[PDB]
């Protein structure tokens, strides 16, 4: 039974609704944040808050200690420049999970990893390159890794009626940020997605 989880990137749009749903689901949530004031002051607050940076190996190590599973929602703060913050952040998380014996990691990359590499728009190639590096870091770690590769993440409401496509592209090109967080929590209750790539999508319009 998974009870204690750590969430990386909980201050982002998708991370905030994932944190809110995880607290309401009864999980003991630990978050790593740059600033504690970025967390919601009222309502769903996490059980444990570590103030630090994901690129600091020691900060990640104390966040992963004693956890049952890890949710990774790392991004590039809306910067299309060539970067390694997501891949290097993933290497710190993987190193900490191996040392402490944590096996379950659910990580969000991008649906572009399911596309023809030549069809990826050139403007988004730099960010996609680091998503590939992070995915390879997690794929080669040997942990129970659920690769979430969502399409466009919108502001649609929480439905729970989305479609989950395994190891391929789904029929819709949009997933709500609430349904995305809902699905990543669902991956903590089952192992049927372990080692697979998941494409959540739904038709809201
Ligand atoms: Na933060």
Please give the full DSSP string across 20-39, using - where no structure is assigned: HHHHHTT-EEEEEES-GGGS
26 is in an annotated binding site: no
Cα(119)–Cα(54) distance, integer angstroms: 31
Distance 47 CA to ligand 1 centre (A): 16
- Name, in order, each residue with C-beta under 8 angstroms of 156's C-beta and a sequence gap of 6 or more: 174, 176, 177, 178, 179, 202, 204
Q: What Å resolution does this PDB entry report?
A: 2.2
Q: Residue 115 in contact with residue 154, Cβ under 8 Å?
A: no
In the chain, domain spans:
1-205
178 is in an annotated binding site: no
How many C-beta atoms surround the C-beta of residue 149 within 10 A?
24
Cα angle 102-99-22, degrees, rounded to a multiple of 5: 30
Query: Which residue in 47, 42, 43, 20 sits closest to 31, CA to CA?
Result: 47
13 is in an annotated binding site: yes
Cα of 201 vs its chain's centroid, Å: 16
Helix, strand, coil content of the chain in percent (nearest 5):
35, 20, 45
Q: Which of 108, 111, 127, 138 is catalytic?
A: 108
Distance 29 CA to ligand 1 centre (A): 15
How many C-beta atoms surround the C-beta of residue 127 within 10 A?
20
Helix-then-strand count for the chain, H and E:
5, 10
Structure tokens at 120: 């990826």
How many C-beta atoms surround the C-beta of residue 45 within 10 A?
14
Residue in the structure block whose two tokens are 């089952």: 190
Specify the 3-state DSSP secondary structure of 154: strand
- Name, in order, each residue with C-beta under 8 angstroms of 90's C-beta and a sequence gap of 6 or more: 72, 74, 107, 134, 137, 138
108 is catalytic: yes
Cα(147)–Cα(108) distance, integer angstroms: 6
Distance 181 CA to ligand 1 centre (A): 17
53 is in an annotated binding site: yes
| CA distances for 5 relative to 19, 28, 57, 136, 200, angstroms | 10, 6, 18, 23, 22
């Amino acid at each position: 039974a998974v009870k204690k989880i750590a969430i990386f990137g909980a201050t982002g749009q998708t991370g905030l609704t994932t944190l809110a749903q995880a607290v309401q689901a009864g999980y003991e949530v630990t978050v790593l944040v740059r600033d504690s004031s970025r967390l919601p002051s009222e309502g769903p607050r996490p059980a444990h808050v570590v103030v630090g940076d994901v690129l600091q190996a020691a900060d990640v190590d104390k966040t992963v200690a004693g956890q049952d599973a890890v949710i990774v929602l790392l991004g590039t703060r809306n910067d299309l420049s060539p970067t390694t913050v997501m891949s290097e952040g993933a290497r710190n998380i993987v190193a900490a999970m191996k040392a402490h014996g944590v096996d379950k990691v659910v990580a969000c990359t991008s649906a572009f990893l399911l596309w023809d590499p030549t069809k990826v728009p050139p403007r988004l190639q730099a960010v996609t390159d680091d998503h590939i590096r992070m995915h390879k870091v997690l794929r080669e770690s040997g942990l129970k890794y659920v690769a979430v590769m969502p399409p466009h993440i919108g502001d649609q409401p929480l439905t729970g009626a989305y479609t989950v496509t395994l190891d391929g592209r789904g029929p819709s090109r949009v997933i709500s940020k609430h349904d995305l967080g809902h699905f990543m929590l669902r991956c903590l209750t089952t192992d049927e997605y372990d080692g697979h790539s998941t494409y959540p999508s739904h038709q809201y319009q």
